[PDB]
Amino acid sequence: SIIRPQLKFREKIDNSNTPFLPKIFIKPNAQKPLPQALSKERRQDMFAHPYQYELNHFTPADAVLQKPQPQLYRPIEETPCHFISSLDELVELNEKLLNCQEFAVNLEHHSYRSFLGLTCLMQISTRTEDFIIDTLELRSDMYILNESLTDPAIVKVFHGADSDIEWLQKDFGLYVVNMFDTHQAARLLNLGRHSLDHLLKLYCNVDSNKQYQLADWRIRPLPEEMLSYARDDTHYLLYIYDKMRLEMWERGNGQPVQLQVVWQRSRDICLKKFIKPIFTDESYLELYRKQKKHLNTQQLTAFQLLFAWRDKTARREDESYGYVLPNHMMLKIAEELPKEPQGIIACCNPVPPLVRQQINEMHLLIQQAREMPLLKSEVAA
């Protein structure tokens, strides 16, 4: 069993209906001052995208828009690998990155034992080295990387950064400026169809392991098989970045028409803001209504309170819905309207721990539901 990494976090995570307030408190590479309300002290819209201005006013430099001379990825077995877990080490890396023409980025996320989700690892590759950053440990010191991630001079290469852009700002208050999504280029080369794993074959004839796409990245220590799985996802990314600019150049008949599009599409992805979610029972009750489930006043109520009891527990304990109580079990309980606490436990296969732990709290809820007055049509029927 793994101990929840959120416990050692210095600042508790907010899982309240409150609207997400960007965590950035010092804005490097700024063109528009960062709202005073966000300064480290006071802790002109506050809920705006910190790098909104710089992003809208960004265009790739001529240097990159010109036909590339692909630089082969360094042989993986000759490429040094660095494990970063201390601020001092993170600060040294950021310093090296600041002297780069461009570098690759990718994150490992987790969501089963977390309400909103949690970023457990960050992978960065330069033309010659590979780095693995422990974003659990350095969670509160990650922001320092904003110096290079928002440096328009350096080009950050990702592959489908859609969610990565949202976890970076939601977890570390980090943002990106000057990004090239290889998945966006891929769409312009009839490849937007396949993943990076496939692009690693077509472009570098490298076999990919997919045993870890859903593994537990909160684990520590990270075994070699996982460290390798992770690095491989940023190591050959710069090469593919050059190769794709080369191919998009030999298509626009000697022009940066397509290149600018990728950069533009990518810049938009970077402009996405994170928004805390909200879930309502109305959604399910709508599906269960089409599946001719026919839930009576009592069942509907039992489901309504269970859905409510779950959202509350998931936010307090900082767990996912699927951990606290998966739908089908919730829906089952709502139907059976179990008279005893033990009756509830029967509907669960298996029985989630927070349910056994609150078995009584839940019992009182079902109980309440069973006291609800049935409509006439539901008594006879």
Binding site for Y ion (CB under 5 A): 197, 208, 233, 281
DSSP classification of residue 155: E
For the bound state, the minimum distance from the C-beta of residue 195 to Y ion, rounded and expressed in Å, comes to 8
Provide the residue type at 328 as one letter: H
Nearer to Y ion, 211 or 255 (CB): 211
Indicate the residue among 360 and 368 with the shorter CB distance to Y ion.
Answer: 368
Q: Are 164 and 105 in contact (CB under 8 A)?
A: yes
Which of 93/199 has CB closer to Y ion?
199
Smallest separation, CB 306 to Y ion (Å) = 12
Q: Which of residues 57 and 198 has its CB atom nearest to Y ion in the complex?
A: 198
d(CA 133, CA 86): 9
Smallest separation, CB 314 to Y ion (Å): 17
Q: Which is nearer to Y ion, 57 or 312 (CB)?
A: 312
Q: Say how far apart CA 241 and CA 196 lie, in whole Å.
A: 12
**Rounded least distance, CB 212 to Y ion, Å:** 8
Q: Return the sign of the alpha-carbon dihedral for residues 8, 11, 12, 14.
A: negative
* Residue 90: exposure state from Cβ atoms within 10 A (0-12, 13-18, ≥19): buried
Q: Which helix (H) or strand (E) holds 18?
A: none
Q: In what order do the strands lie in the sheet with 155-158?
A: 81-84, 130-134, 118-125, 102-110, 155-158, 179-181
The CB-of-197 to Y ion minimum distance in angstroms stands at 5
Find the shortest distance in angstroms from Cβ 344 to Y ion.
21
DSSP secondary structure letter of residue 345: H
Q: Which is nearer to Y ion, 85 or 208 (CB)?
A: 208
* Minimum CB distance to Y ion smaller for 178 or for 234: 234
**12 Cβ neighbours under 8 A, 6+ residues apart:** none
In the bound complex, what is the minimum distance in angstroms from residue 367's beta carbon to Y ion?
Answer: 20
CB of 315 vs Y ion, minimal distance in Å: 17
Q: Which token pair is 351?
A: 């029985």
Handedness of CA 284, 273, 48, 263 (dihedral sign): negative
Is the Cβ–Cβ distance between 175 and 200 less than 8 Å?
A: no
Contact (CB, 8 A) for 84 and 133: yes
Taking the complex as a whole, the smallest distance from the CB of residue 10 to Y ion amounts, in Å, to 32
Distance from chain centroid for Cα 298: 38
Q: Which residues have CB under 8 Å from 330's CB, separation 6+?
A: 303, 306, 307, 310
Task: Rank residues 134 and 281 by Cβ distance to Y ion and give the closer one.
Answer: 281
Distance from C-alpha of 337 to C-alpha of 133, rounded to nearest angstrom: 48
Residue number with CB closer to Y ion (54 or 335) = 335
| Cα-based torsion angle of the residue sequence 150, 153, 156, 157 in order, rounded to the nearest 10 degrees | 160
